[PDB]
Amino acid sequence: XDYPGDHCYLYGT
Amino acid sequence: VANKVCLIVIDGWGVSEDPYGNAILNAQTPVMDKLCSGNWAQIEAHGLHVGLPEGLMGNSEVGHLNIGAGRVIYQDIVRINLAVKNNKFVTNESLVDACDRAKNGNGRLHLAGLVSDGGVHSHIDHMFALVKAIKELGVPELYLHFYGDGRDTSPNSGVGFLEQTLEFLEKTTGYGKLATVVGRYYAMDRDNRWERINVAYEAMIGGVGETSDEAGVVEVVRKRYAADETDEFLKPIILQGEKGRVQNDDTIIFFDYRADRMREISAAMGMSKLAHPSNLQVYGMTQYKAEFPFKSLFPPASNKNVLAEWLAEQKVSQFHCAETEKYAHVTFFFNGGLEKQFEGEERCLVPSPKVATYDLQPEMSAAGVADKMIEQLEAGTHPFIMCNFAPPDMVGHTGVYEAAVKACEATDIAIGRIYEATQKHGYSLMVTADHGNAEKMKAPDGGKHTAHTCYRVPLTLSHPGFKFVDPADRHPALCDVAPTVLAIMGLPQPAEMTGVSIVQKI
Ligand code: NA
Ligand code: NA
Ligand SMILES: [Zn+2]
Ligand SMILES: [Zn+2]
């Protein structure tokens, strides 16, 4: 969530 | 503005002709049955089309980011893999900077990170690519600090990655030296257990650990395995002696792309009874903390002139509306993955119902979102308005098929109400989605399917003055929505939006 394209964007919600 | 535009982003509504467990097809959806006919498009919302790894389903955060941005934002893994494939490390601005610092300084550079093919925090292939490029850039002296995995890979796979590394350095590059092996339990703590970090820190700076060399280090690890000490928990092994320590004036690159487990060790280097080396410069593969002074090999996409910013720059006001569960999606993510609100941008939060699970109230607050959008259409103040409809995704995630049917019915009703108001008040309607979900509620087994999908999503347009076209070189995708909106509105497209408009004016 800290920058566009970091690891949280791989799964999201 | 030539045409005012209302953009509906349905959450979790994909295009599937497969009718089994398809809550959209089986729901009464007479409005979308009509809007998704004639002049409409079907656009991609998963995988490389939205900057994710091939074959990966889309999601709400990626989807709204790409819709709002009018370009593909490449997720870290894809972005770095492309740089490796296309031999772009050797011209990477920050890598050249790190290598120039070593060459103009004491000649010494360090690489440190998780050495496996797990791909969660790092990949060994990236480290290999870095060594090859650093060699080509002429750095005099290069040391590797190997963090053992055993968590994203099996607990006794580390000796295989250690063999690969030794062979690579000796026979493929003939350049670079392994200096430290230590388990990720120590090097990659994220719980402020600095007694763990200190083990890795003293190994790197002071050589505190078991002495070995290239001929013996695999056997050291095999003895650890036999003592039931596996990769994640490897106590430090020290190679090359003092030469291989992080010393005064040295340069260090951490090659992990996942920030959370790099923050502690990178901060310890860049900012115990051992003397701390002075005048280090630290680089991360990616940004680990905006507050750090570290350069990044792959810094965050600047994402200048996303749609919300661009409209404000053109002095056009705008409206963003969602219910509670998707409010961040139409603000933080739609606006580029940061908390910034632009001049003239009005926001509207509709409360989600207070229920234990959303299959208990599958219409959620779609009617309230429609009410607020209709109000804006009647006023006509904002030339661009957009909303999100939460039910298909949020009820989809419960896995309850009949609830998902009702979610899609409620969403279709709401869309029709907005559509009728756009026709009365002179707006063009475009309906899209951020990824699929509710079109696939059952696995082939008959069991629940609670996840997103890789199906395409709709893109509709009520304005009869435009025809949908395809890009020359690829499927249409979410990155083309904002360009298409701007064309319909008669507004300019910023150069930073490298997506394309997929309409032609007749
Ligand atoms: Na239907
Ligand atoms: Na699903
Ligand atoms: Zn979802
Ligand atoms: Zn979504």
The nearest CA of chain A is from the CA of B426 a distance in Å of: 35
Closest CA to B466 of B425, B416, B409, B428: B428
Contact assessment for residue B419 and residue B375, using Cβ atoms and an 8 Å cutoff = no
Question: Ligand 1: distance of its center to the CA of B356 in Å?
Answer: 27
| DSSP H stretches of helix in B120-231 | 124-136, 158-167, 184-187, 194-206, 217-226
CB pairs under 8 A between A and B: 58
- CATH assignment at residue B100: 3.40.1450.10
Question: Ligand 3: distance of its center to the CA of B453 in Å?
Answer: 10
CA B375 to chain centre: 35
Sign, CA dihedral B115-B119-B124-B126, equals negative
Interface test with A, best of B66, B75, B190 (most A CBs within 10 A): B75
Residue B18: both structure tokens together: 């497969």
Question: In this structure, which ligand is nearest to the CA of B449?
Answer: 2
The nearest CA of chain B is from the CA of A2 a distance in Å of: 8
For Cα atoms B263, B264, B267, give the angle at the middle one, nearest 5 degrees.
80
Matching residue, tokens 């200096």 = B179
Closest Cβ opposite residue A4 in set B56, B77, B337: B337
The nearest CA of chain B is from the CA of A5 a distance in Å of: 4
Closest Cβ opposite residue A13 in set B61, B259, B336: B61
Contacts of B303 (CB under 8 A, 6+ apart): A4, B69, B73, B336, B337, B338, B496
Strands of the sheet with B457-460, listed across from one edge: B40-43, B457-460, B427-433, B4-10, B384-389, B318-323, B345-350
Does B110 belong to an annotated binding site? Answer: no
Query: Rounded to a whole number, what is the largest CA-CA distance in chain B?
Result: 80
Q: What is the resolution of this structure in A?
A: 1.8
Residues with CB under 5 A from ligand 1 (ion): B 25, 27, 29
Burial class (CB in 10 A: 0-12, 13-18, 19+), B231: buried
Domain assignment of residue B230, given as a range: 77-284
Contacts of B469 (CB under 8 A, 6+ apart): B502, B503, B504
Do residue A10 and residue B258 have CB atoms under 8 angstroms apart? no
Contact assessment for residue B294 and residue B266, using Cβ atoms and an 8 Å cutoff = yes
Does B151 belong to an annotated binding site? Answer: yes
Does B60 belong to an annotated binding site? Answer: yes
Q: Which residue of B has its CA nearest to A9?
A: B62
Residues of A in contact with B257 (CB under 8 A): 7
The amino acid at B318? Q
Question: Ligand 3: distance of its center to the CA of B181 in Å?
Answer: 40
Distance CA B424, CA B427 (A): 8
Does B117 belong to an annotated binding site? Answer: no
Question: Ligand 4: distance of its center to the CA of A13 in Å?
Answer: 7
Contact assessment for residue B428 and residue B462, using Cβ atoms and an 8 Å cutoff = yes
The nearest CA of chain A is from the CA of B175 a distance in Å of: 31
Contacts of B312 (CB under 8 A, 6+ apart): B318, B342, B343, B344, B345
Contact assessment for residue B449 and residue B10, using Cβ atoms and an 8 Å cutoff = no
Contacts of B453 (CB under 8 A, 6+ apart): B14, B16, B46, B57, B58, B435, B436, B437, B439, B440
Closest Cβ opposite residue A7 in set B56, B74, B76: B76
The amino acid at B357? T
Question: Ligand 3: distance of its center to the CA of B437 in Å?
Answer: 7
User: Which residues in B77-207 belong to E strands, given as ranges?
Assistant: 108-114, 141-148, 177-183
Interface test with B, best of A1, A8, A13 (most B CBs within 10 A): A13
Question: What was the structure determination method?
Answer: X-ray
Contact assessment for residue B364 and residue B353, using Cβ atoms and an 8 Å cutoff = yes
Distance CA B335, CA B342 (A): 9
Beta bridge partners of B340: none
Contact assessment for residue B153 and residue B231, using Cβ atoms and an 8 Å cutoff = yes
Closest Cβ opposite residue A13 in set B52, B60, B257: B60
Residue B295: both structure tokens together: 């350069």
Q: What are phi and psi of B295, to 5 degrees?
A: -70, 155
The residues of B annotated with a catalytic role in the active site are 60
Residue B39: both structure tokens together: 């002049």
Residue B493: both structure tokens together: 């497209």
Question: Residue B476 region, left (φ>0) first, then alpha (ψ -120 to 50), else beta?
Answer: beta
Residue B460: both structure tokens together: 């509709």
